[PDB]
RNA sequence: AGAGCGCAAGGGUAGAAGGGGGCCUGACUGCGAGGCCUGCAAGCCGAGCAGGGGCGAAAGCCGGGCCUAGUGAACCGGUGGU
RNA sequence: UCCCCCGUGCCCAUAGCGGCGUGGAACCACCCGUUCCCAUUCCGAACACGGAAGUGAAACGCGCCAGCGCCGAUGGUACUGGGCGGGCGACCGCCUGGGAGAGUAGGUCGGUGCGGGGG
């Protein structure tokens, strides 16, 4: 990344902007609950995805961690946490679309996404595609 | 450009918009905060002969007669994007000389 | 397609949905009217119908209006339609996203590649009479690393691209298995 | 660390409001820059402080490009 | 001194020729020469203020006018310059002294140039103007060899009502400009 | 450097601030005393 | 003043510039 | 207007507060209607009046710097004056 | 009263950017000239003065077009004064009053005072 050191905690209000619509690929993965998604959680999912289907199509990761995760070294109260221990996270609210696959079968996707679910903290759902866009 | 114009606007009343042409020289006593001209002594497009400078002096005296009649006297001049030196000079020059 | 619409007036927008009716509104350069279709009906209708083909709405006034969904408000928090726009057409030309059937076996998938596909539909100025079920896309000569743009589209008669004459349409990206996992894990 | 620092509050902003009777000289509005412009019977000082020049009522006048002005309409 | 060769050359020669090659409708549309400008990149005379006067006075003669100065503003740490101090020479000339200079140009300066070949036809700003570079300044008439302490270079430009370089190319060629075809 | 201006042919001072090495050795700026009005003020 | 360009090759043009005695060479005549 | 506005950041600003010349030293004295702020003390803005003066043809501007930091009650003592 | 101009104040991009067309009788500009008042760190480009003739090319004035810019409903949300309910909790839901942003329809090459010259 690049920007600057430490950030507020902030609360996770309504699932508003946290949520979208399958914007790429055929199938997708959507969050049901709010949470901070770690960098290791994303990588854990992505790798479990591709590793499932070797030489797979294309995997889109629409969420992205930019929030520095603060944390203290097991002492007390001097100043702000050094942080960064868990690295960073992504403000994922219910309805959001983390991953979506493309150029692959329905079984491969239905399994791969199912797998990349357990790798995540949140209880999730898999959406197909429909036609819900914005046109005429 | 019109810095000067803005300066006088906030000054008070009875602005003297001296717009001069390459051959003409009009002059209006516009009172702001309402936008209305009073004494509008034109030049070439009025009656006067043909001699910019000397014409300017007289048109100034023209305002004077029409002005002192309406009970005006605030010499709120308007340089109007023009260097005070020549044509415009005579305007207020004669206008204030009487 | 057909769809049984109704006039709305004072019915509570929220309390309405609980019943089973989807709020919506029809309008054009001269029209504007509170309406409300049925969820289940609109669903199966709009499933195929979507926003490429036209749908005439049968109001109790016997009026058959040639409308199409100019916009839909999808409800966040588990997808589902909240509200529906209905643009009524006439005879003057009107812009709209027309489908696109990419047809062919590109060189990309041959050398093991990926079916990339940007605009799965394209907005284009067109007369209301012209209702192209779709547009042929000659994707086949497309190899890995290559792409297809708007300036290269096959336009049917009486139609123009109401977009940028350079926009992309599709592409061919690589896989991403072992070669990247082993390499990326160390090179980072 | 090395942070706990801050200059005390300056308590600026709109001091008087539209429709308020004012003496001669009451600071109408203290401000950082030119968030408000002068106007009819309204002067300003080194800090851009806006203040009445006459007695009357405050009024605000938005003018897009020109900006926001504030004046006092005299009366007695 | 309103009278010279190039003066009438534009009038009784180039004026009607332009009406031929493209044809106009008004005399104020015909591409008119009206602004010549000179320039010198003097990052050199930054140290010596003396060398600055020399370049300007040699310039005053060749330009047949009064020279001027123009310092930098957002300057080169890399080359010993910083803010408002150094120098750059410039002198704009128009009207009569403009034509007199163009005369010394294609009748004295251009000829005795080091292996002159012509003026690069690409040196058009795309619009109706032209910029050219020159090394030795002694190629000018009044300049004596036993006087130039340094072969200070400089580049000149020229503005015209031309809106296309085709109009410019035709206009300048008719003016007697030896274009390297 | 703290500076103090004196009056000519009189005994009056004034608040000032000169510069040490910076181009400024003397101070010949005019000023206004209480006795009479306006007379040149030297540094001193 | 009429600057007479005395270019050494067979050309003497009466232009206008400082000092009529303008000693040049290799002008437009050659 | 993303520059510049001596320096942090910010608000402001080319219809100048920015860049450049000409004349000049209002980086004046004697005051101060009325206010902002405020526990106290302190800090802040200020029209206008009298004196004498500067720049401008003039209406007019000038009681230091675009503004918000650049500082220290009282005591004791130093130097110059009525 | 009606129409074209010239000066100027109000509304503050629905006034603008760009494209095409048009006006020189009047008005304005460009323009002729650089002796006088005056001027450019260099130039009569700009300020300035005296003025034939030529032009409406540039500039400005007036029209038309919407491609950029700008303006922009309605419906439905998000959010939320006040009230309250469920669950163990991270949070979710209803009643009452208020209600955006974005997006769709759509609009837009300006309204307008006062004085003056001209038929
Ligand atoms: Mg950093
Ligand atoms: Mg830090
Ligand atoms: Mg943080
Ligand atoms: Mg979603
Ligand atoms: Mg402890
Ligand atoms: Mg799980
Ligand atoms: Mg008005
Ligand atoms: Mg079809
Ligand atoms: Mg290739
Ligand atoms: Mg390629
Ligand atoms: Mg291609
Ligand atoms: Mg604190
Ligand atoms: Mg504070
Ligand atoms: Mg003051
Ligand atoms: Mg100040
Ligand atoms: Mg520079
Ligand atoms: Mg010889
Ligand atoms: Mg700025
Ligand atoms: Mg100042
Ligand atoms: Mg500058
Ligand atoms: Mg300066
Ligand atoms: Mg100065
Ligand atoms: Mg007080
Ligand atoms: Mg107090
Ligand atoms: Mg202070
Ligand atoms: Mg006296
Ligand atoms: Mg001051
Ligand atoms: Mg300061
Ligand atoms: Mg200053
Ligand atoms: Mg402040
Ligand atoms: Mg003590
Ligand atoms: Mg008419
Ligand atoms: Mg015509
Ligand atoms: Mg001529
Ligand atoms: Mg001269
Ligand atoms: Mg002379
Ligand atoms: Mg200059
Ligand atoms: Mg001239
Ligand atoms: Mg034309
Ligand atoms: Mg035009
Ligand atoms: Mg448009
Ligand atoms: Mg907009
Ligand atoms: Mg607005
Ligand atoms: Mg809107
Ligand atoms: Mg609404
Ligand atoms: Mg209340
Ligand atoms: Mg509450
Ligand atoms: Mg309500
Ligand atoms: Mg609103
Ligand atoms: Mg809206
Ligand atoms: Mg928008
Ligand atoms: Mg209109
Ligand atoms: Mg209108
Ligand atoms: Mg008007
Ligand atoms: Mg009217
Ligand atoms: Mg008639
Ligand atoms: Mg007639």
Q: Which residues contact E162 (CB under 8 A, 6 or more apart)?
A: E31, E127, E128, E129, E168, E171
Say if residue E49 is exposed, middle or buried (CB neighbours under 10 Å; 0-12, 13-18, 19+). Answer: exposed
**Cα–Cα dist C121/A82, whole Å:** 49
CB A6 within 8 A of CB A83: yes
Instruction: Tokens for E62, please give them.
Output: 């060749």
Residue among E59, E141, E177 with most chain G CBs within 10 A, to mutate: E141
C26, C27, C76: best mutation site toward chain A, by most A Cβ within 10 Å? C76
Residue bearing tokens 């306006």: F38
Between CA A97 and CA C76 the distance in angstroms is: 11
Protein CA F42 to sugar C1' H81 (Å): 17
Helix axes B52-70, B87-96, angle to 10 degrees: 40
Spatial distance between the Cα atoms of B27 and B91, rounded to a whole number of angstroms: 8
Sign of the C-alpha dihedral computed for residues G18, G23, G26 and G28 taken in this order: positive
DSSP state of E145: T
Q: Where are the alpha helices (DSSP H) in chain A?
A: 39-52, 106-118
For residues E166 and E130, give the distance between their C-alpha atoms in angstroms, rounded to a whole number: 12
Nucleotide of closest approach to B76 (CA, C1'):
H59
SS3 D75: coil
F12 vs A59: CA distance, rounded Å = 86
Residues pairing with C75 in the sheet: none
Closest alpha carbon within chain D to A80: D1
CA dihedral E147, E148, E149, E155 (to 10 degrees): 160
Looking at beta carbons, which pairs linking E56-59 to residues 24 or more positions away fall under 8 Å?
Answer: E56/E89, E58/E137, E58/E143, E58/E148, E58/E152, E59/E89, E59/E91, E59/E137, E59/E154
Q: What is the Å distance from ligand 23's center to D25 Cα? A: 11
Helices (H), A70-132: 106-118
Decide: CB of F34 under 7 A of nucleic strand H.
Answer: yes
B84 touches strand H (CB under 7 A): yes
H-only helix segments in chain C: 13-19, 39-49, 107-110, 178-187
Inter-CA distances, D22 with A55, D36, D41, E137, F35, Å: 79, 18, 12, 74, 41
Q: D76 with D34: CB under 8 angstroms?
A: no
Short-list C107, C188, C128, C118, CA closest to C148:
C118
Alpha carbon distance E62, E137 (integer Å): 9
Which residue from B79, B5, B98, B87 is spatially nearest to B54, judged by alpha carbons?
A: B87
In angstroms, what CA-CA distances link E40 with D54, E53, E57, E87, E101? 60, 13, 13, 9, 17
The separation between CA E82 and the C-alpha centre of its own chain, rounded to angstroms, equals 28
| Contact indicator for G22, G3 with CB cutoff of 8 Å | yes
Q: Which residue spans within D1-76 are E strands per DSSP?
A: 13-14, 21-22, 27-30, 42-44, 50-52, 56-63, 67-74
User: Checking DSSP bridges between strand C101-102 and strand C136-137, what pairing results, if any?
Assistant: parallel
Q: Which residues of chain D does A79 touch, with a Cβ-Cβ cutoff of 8 Å?
A: 1, 3
CB-proximal positions of chain H, under 7 Å? 10-13, 15-17, 19-20, 24-30, 33-38, 44-47, 51-53, 57-60, 64-68, 80-82
Structure tokens given for D26? 């009451």
- Positive or negative, the Cα torsion across A54, A56, A58, A61? negative
C29 touches strand I (CB under 7 A): yes
Angle made by CA atoms G14, G20, G24, in degrees to the nearest 5: 80
Query: Which residues of chain G lie closer than 8 angstroms to E116, CB-CB?
Result: none
How many residue pairs from chains A and C have C-beta atoms closer than 8 A? Answer: 87
CA distance E155 to E131: 7
CB-based contact E105:E9 (threshold 8 Å)? no
DSSP letters, C68-100, are E-S-EEE-SSS--EEEEEEEEP-SS-EEEEEE-
- Contacts D1 to A, Cβ<8 Å: 78-80
Neighbours of C21 (CB within 10 A): 19
Angle D32-D34-D36 from CA coordinates, rounded to 5°:
105
Residue of G5, G22, G25 with shortest CB distance to E112: G25
Method used to obtain the model: X-ray
CA-CA-CA-CA torsion for E4, E10, E16, E22, nearest 10 degrees?
A: 180
Tell me how crowded residue E151 is: count the other CB atoms within 10 A of its CB: 9
Determine the Cα–Cα distance for residues A63 and A42; give it in Å rounded to an integer: 9
How far does the CA of residue A112 sit from the closest CA of chain C (Å)?
13
Residues of C in contact with A15 (CB under 8 A): 76-77
> In 10 A of CB C101, how many CB atoms?
11
Within 8 A by CB and 6+ apart from C150, the residues are C119, C122, C161, C163, C164, C165, C166, C167, C168, C169
D64 Cβ contacts chain H strand, under 7 Å: no
Ligand whose nearest atom lies closest to the CA of C14: 48
Token output for B58: 């007289």
Hey, which bits of B2-64 come out as E strands? 15-17, 28-31, 36-40
> Who contacts A109 (Cβ-Cβ below 8 Å, separation ≥6)?
A26, A27, A101
The shortest C-alpha distance from A75 to chain D (Å) reads 15
């Amino acid at each position: 990344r690049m920007k600057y050191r430490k950030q507020q905690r902030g609360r996770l209000k309504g699932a508003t902007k946290g949520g979208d619509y399958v914007a790429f690929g055929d199938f997708g993965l959507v969050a049901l609950e709010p949470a901070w998604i770690t960098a290791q959680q994303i990588e854990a999912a992505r790798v479990a995805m591709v590793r499932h289907f070797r030489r797979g199509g294309k995997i889109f990761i629409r969420i992205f961690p930019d929030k520095p995760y603060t944390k203290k070294p097991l002492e007390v109260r001097m100043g702000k946490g050094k942080g960064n221990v868990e690295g960073y996270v992504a403000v994922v609210k219910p309805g959001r679309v983390m991953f979506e696959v493309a150029g692959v079968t329905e079984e491969q996707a239905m399994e791969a996404l199912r797998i990349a679910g357990h790798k995540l903290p949140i209880k999730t759902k898999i959406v197909r595609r429909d036609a819900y866009d914005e046109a005429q | 450009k019109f810095r000067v114009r803005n300066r006088i606007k906030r000054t008070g009343r009875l602005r003297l918009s001296v717009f001069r042409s390459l051959k003409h020289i009009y002059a209006q006593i516009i009172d702001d905060e309402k936008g209305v001209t009073l004494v509008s002594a034109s030049s070439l497009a009025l009656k006067l002969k043909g001699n910019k400078t000397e014409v300017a002096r007289q048109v100034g005296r023209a305002l004077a007669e029409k002005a002192l009649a309406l009970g005006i006297k605030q010499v709120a001049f308007d340089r109007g994007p023009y260097k005070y030196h020549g044509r415009v000079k005579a305007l207020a020059e004669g206008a204030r000389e009487g | 397609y057909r769809l049984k619409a109704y006039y709305r007036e004072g019915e509570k927008p929220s309390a309405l949905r609980r019943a089973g009716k989807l709020p919506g509104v029809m309008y054009n350069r001269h029209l504007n009217r509170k309406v409300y279709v049925d969820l289940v009906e609109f669903d199966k209708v709009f499933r195929q119908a979507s926003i490429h083909h036209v749908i005439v709405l049968e109001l109790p006034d016997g009026q058959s209006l040639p409308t199409l969904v100019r916009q839909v408000n999808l409800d966040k928090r588990r997808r589902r339609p909240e509200h529906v726009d209905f643009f009524v057409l006439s005879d003057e030309p009107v812009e709209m996203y027309v489908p696109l059937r990419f047809v062919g076996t590109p060189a990309g998938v041959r050398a093991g590649g990926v079916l990339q596909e940007i605009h799965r539909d394209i907005l284009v100025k067109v007369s209301p009479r012209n209702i192209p079920e779709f547009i042929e896309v000659d994707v086949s000569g497309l190899e890995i690393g290559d792409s297809l743009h708007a300036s290269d589209l096959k336009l049917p008669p009486g139609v123009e691209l109401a977009v940028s004459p350079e926009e992309t349409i599709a592409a061919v990206v690589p896989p991403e298995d072992v070669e990247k996992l082993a390499e990326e894990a160390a090179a980072e | 660390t090395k942070n706990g620092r801050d200059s005390q509050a300056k308590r600026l902003g709109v001091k008087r409001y539209e429709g308020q009777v004012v003496r001669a000289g009451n600071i109408l509005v203290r401000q950082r820059g030119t968030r408000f412009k002068p106007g009819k019977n309204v002067g300003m000082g080194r800090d851009f402080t806006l203040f009445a020049l006459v007695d009357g009522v405050v009024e605000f006048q938005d003018r897009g490009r020109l900006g926001r002005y504030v004046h006092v309409r005299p009366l007695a | 001194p309103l009278d010279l060769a190039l003066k009438r050359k534009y009038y009784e020669e180039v004026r009607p020729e332009l009406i031929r090659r493209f044809g106009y409708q008004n005399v104020w549309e015909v591409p008119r020469l009206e602004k010549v400008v000179i320039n010198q990149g003097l990052g050199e005379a930054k140290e010596d203020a003396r060398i600055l006067e020399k370049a300007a006075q040699e310039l005053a003669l060749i330009t047949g006018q009064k020279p001027a100065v123009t310092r930098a503003k957002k300057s080169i740490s890399n080359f010993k310059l910083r803010k408002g101090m150094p120098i750059g020479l410039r002198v704009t000339l128009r009207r009569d002294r403009m034509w007199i200079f163009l005369e010394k140009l294609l009748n004295v300066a251009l000829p005795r140039i080091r292996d002159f070949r012509g003026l690069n036809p690409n040196s058009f700003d795309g619009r109706g103007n032209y910029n050219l570079g020159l090394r030795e300044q002694l190629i000018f008439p009044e300049i004596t060899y036993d006087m130039v302490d340094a072969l200070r270079g400089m580049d000149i430009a020229v503005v015209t009502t031309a809106e296309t370089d085709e109009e410019a190319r035709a206009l300048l060629e008719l003016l007697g400009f030896p274009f390297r075809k | 450097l703290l500076l103090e201006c004196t009056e000519c042919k009189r005994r009056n001072y004034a608040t000032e601030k000169n510069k040490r090495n910076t181009p400024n050795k003397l101070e010949l700026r005019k000023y206004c005393p209480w006795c009479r009005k306006h007379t040149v003020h030297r540094e001193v | 003043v009429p600057a007479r360009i005395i270019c050494g090759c067979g050309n003497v043009i009466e232009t206008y510039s400082t000092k009529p005695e303008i000693y040049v060479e290799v002008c437009s005549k050659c």
